[PDB]
Swiss-Prot record:
Other known facts: Present with 17100 molecules/cell in log phase SD medium.
Protein name: Eukaryotic translation initiation factor 2 subunit alpha
Impact when changing residue 85 to A: Alters the binding mode to the eIF2B complex
Entry's Gene Ontology BP terms: formation of translation preinitiation complex; translational initiation
Major location (coarse): cytoplasm
GO cellular component: cytoplasm; cytoplasmic stress granule; cytosol; eukaryotic 48S preinitiation complex; eukaryotic translation initiation factor 2 complex; multi-eIF complex; ribosome
Consequence of substituting residue 50 to A: Inhibits derepression of GCN4 expression in amino acid, purine, and glucose-starved cells
PTM section of the record: Phosphorylated; phosphorylation on Ser-50 by the GCN2 protein kinase occurs in response to low amino acid, carbon, or purine availability. Phosphorylation inhibits the guanine nucleotide exchange factor activity of the eIF2B complex.
Originating organism: Saccharomyces cerevisiae (strain ATCC 204508 / S288c) (Baker's yeast)
Gene name linked to the record: SUI2
Amino acid sequence: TSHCRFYENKYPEIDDIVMVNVQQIAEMGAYVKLLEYDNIEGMILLSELSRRRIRSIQKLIRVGKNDVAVVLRVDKEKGYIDLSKRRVSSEDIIKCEEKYQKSKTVHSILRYCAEKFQIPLEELYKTIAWPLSRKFGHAYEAFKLSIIDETVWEGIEPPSKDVLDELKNYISKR
């Protein structure tokens, strides 16, 4: 449709560095959404927001803004996810931002097709993006590689040869 998770796994793994958007700041901590996992809910309790004891949170974290966090716990039965901002090194922030930007581009591209050819976005991910990602590490890389090498598309069975062409074609411009 118009939204779908970036990766194959529904939930992130522990120790994963995810990009998040801060929805609000409660008394227990911050509520955020995982931009890369179709906006599922995640929490960062106070002691994990920083070392200091804020007692004036809206000062350190600004609502509506993105941020980087590490996954500490994941309860798949209830859908709860515990994250930390504290523990993220400055290097992790840079790596996370780079990956997100790439995943964002891939998504934006696949979205173009999803609409145009009127097909469910998740099918394209399952049929193009993830498989390519499984082979070249990240779909974004495969897309760039495809520009200079057709052998990339080998094995990929799109929903219809028609879409694959519009894709090959779209990746070219810009």
